[PDB]
């Protein structure tokens, strides 16, 4: 990917930070894909997460190409969801949504899935040809038993707001999270090691 034009189709500071720290050079072009798919339409939550990442990356790829007639080399999409007792949780709409999510998660183990779509693009015959490679990573996370007081403490901080399931493992989310099991970068927002393995598959 060194001398290729790479587009990260995500406004997430946490995803950007992970890719930058890994040494990747990329431009940030957030997706306008605002349709959210029917969760019931997918056999698995990770199927849902991948398709969502694919659609965001394809939206960006086509939009860029339509704009200046330049096929971006690679467009990366990602979508992180939480599942607990069979329900998919995404980002909280407001603080009250956040509290409900965290109550649900309290004292339980849940899964975090990040679906990733790597889209290779080229232009031929006045159209964008896209080749999509799709993968996901699952990490299990355990919450300790949260009190009404801690719950509202964390909600009022605002930390829940930009995060799947309304929490993070990194800061004052540390008071909520008892343990993580698998790839921790996947929980932050991007499964870096899996991505790197995917690039090896695609280029070798």
Author numbering: 10 to 213
Please share excerpts from the published article on this structure.
Maf (for multicopy associated filamentation) proteins represent a large family of conserved proteins implicated in cell division arrest but whose biochemical activity remains unknown. Here, we show that the prokaryotic and eukaryotic Maf proteins exhibit nucleotide pyrophosphatase activity against 5-methyl-UTP, pseudo-UTP, 5-methyl-CTP, and 7-methyl-GTP, which represent the most abundant modified bases in all organisms, as well as against canonical nucleotides dTTP, UTP, and CTP. The protomer structures of the four Maf proteins revealed a large β sheet containing seven β strands (β1 to β7) with two α-helical subdomains on one side and one long α helix on another side. Thus, pyrophosphatase activity of Maf proteins toward canonical and modified nucleotides might provide the molecular mechanism for a dual role of these proteins in cell division arrest and house cleaning.
In many eukaryotic Maf proteins, including the human ASMTL, the N-terminal YhdE-like Maf domain is covalently fused to another domain encoding a predicted methyltransferase protein, whereas in some archaeal genomes (e.g., Staphylothermus marinus), the Maf gene is associated with a methyltransferase gene, suggesting a functional relationship between these proteins. Whereas both YceF-like proteins were inactive against these substrates (30–90 nmol/min per milligram of protein), the four YhdE-like Maf proteins (E. coli YhdE, BSU28050, YOR111W, and ASMTL-Maf) showed significant metal-dependent pyrophosphatase activity against pyrimidine nucleoside triphosphates dTTP, UTP, and CTP. In the ASMTL-Maf structure, two protomers form a dimer via the formation of a common large β sheet through the interaction between their β6 strands. This oligomeric state is consistent with the results of our gel-filtration analysis, which showed that ASMTL-Maf exists as a dimer in solution (observed molecular mass, 44.5 kDa; predicted monomer molecular mass, 28.3 kDa), whereas YhdE exists as a mixture of dimers and tetramers (observed molecular mass, 47.2 and 101 kDa, respectively; predicted monomer molecular mass, 24 kDa) and YceF as a mixture of monomers and dimers (observed molecular mass, 24.8 and 50 kDa, respectively; predicted molecular mass, 24.5 kDa). In ASMTL-Maf, the phosphate molecule is located close to the side chains of the conserved Ser19 (2.4 Å), Arg24 (2.6 Å), Lys65 (2.6 Å), and Lys100 (4.0 Å), and it probably mimics the position of the substrate γ-phosphate. In Maf proteins and structurally similar ITP pyrophosphatases, the side chain of the predicted catalytic Asp (ASMTL-Maf Asp88; YOR111W Asp103) interacts with the conserved Lys (ASMTL-Maf Lys65, 2.9 Å; YOR111W Lys74), possibly stabilizing the unprotonated state of Asp.
